[PDB]
């Protein structure tokens, strides 16, 4: 059995608010033909502006990952793309009635549930993977992001906060998707912010849609959310979720390993751009026989 490209079986809709804009937004996920990739569409505009979710269309990366075409933007794509990558969706149209993707509960959980509710459709074309053949790294100050050849898909991440809440083994995590489920162990990890940083963002008219219902708020000594964390290491697992979404801007599932040290959307995008430019470090591969493949996907 060939590892096939996947799309959605049915259209599905969601309503929410943009984390940074605070704007109400309607999201529609639609099936798409083979080799379309993930394509965002601003349906509030006339004509409709389509922006493929590709590294070349990445705009500002100071807070969230943004896609740009001309002066048309699609903000905060990373959690939705993380859900797409996690469920192996190759092709889909993502329609939005506003510039920013809804934040939902701040994780990829509501998206993974909406996608699986609609169901997946295997398509009549081989799924294309980007296989890391050589190591590629990028650094900036003490931040680092690396691609390493690896027979499968693995993400390691380490955060470094000199803070009472961020001590012990909860500051690093590695997820090997051959034995670990993206859905159970990464997808529910919510976005987070430190109270002083969030205050700064609010003073700059950013984080307008943020609340304890869609973000973990940390002050100088504790988690302010009354109901607590979903994972003991929720923060570093959210950084893993971000990296998976940002890596999906390559346009294809990866066969390799990512390692991040204090990395964020900007350095993740720099890593993709360096990888793409270094064509000796990667190749496109397919699996006409699923038994020889190092990556496996759930039933559609
Ligand atoms: C973890 C970070 O890398 C980032 N998240 C943020 O930058 C961020 C920004 C603002 C808020 C917020 C908020 C808020 C506003 C008012 C009241 C309570 C929370 C949360 C996370 C992120 O998840 N990018 O995808
Ligand atoms: Zn995030």
Curated annotation (Swiss-Prot):
Keyword Cell membrane on entry: no
The UniProt record lists the keyword Metal-binding: yes
Catalysed reaction equations from the record: a UDP-3-O-[(3R)-3-hydroxyacyl]-N-acetyl-alpha-D-glucosamine + H2O = a UDP-3-O-[(3R)-3-hydroxyacyl]-alpha-D-glucosamine + acetate
Active site residues per record: 265
BP GO terms, sorted: lipid A biosynthetic process
Keyword annotations: Hydrolase, Lipid A biosynthesis, Lipid biosynthesis, Lipid metabolism, Metal-binding, Zinc
The enzyme's E.C. designation: 3.5.1.108
GO CC list: membrane
Swiss-Prot/TrEMBL cofactor(s): Zn(2+)
Superkingdom: Bacteria
Top-level class of the enzyme under EC nomenclature: hydrolase
GO function term, MF aspect, one: UDP-3-O-acyl-N-acetylglucosamine deacetylase activity
Family to which the UniProt record says this protein belongs: Belongs to the LpxC family.
Name this protein carries in UniProt: UDP-3-O-acyl-N-acetylglucosamine deacetylase
Source organism per UniProt: Pseudomonas aeruginosa (strain ATCC 15692 / DSM 22644 / CIP 104116 / JCM 14847 / LMG 12228 / 1C / PRS 101 / PAO1)
Record lineage: Bacteria, Pseudomonadati, Pseudomonadota, Gammaproteobacteria, Pseudomonadales
Encoding gene (name): lpxC
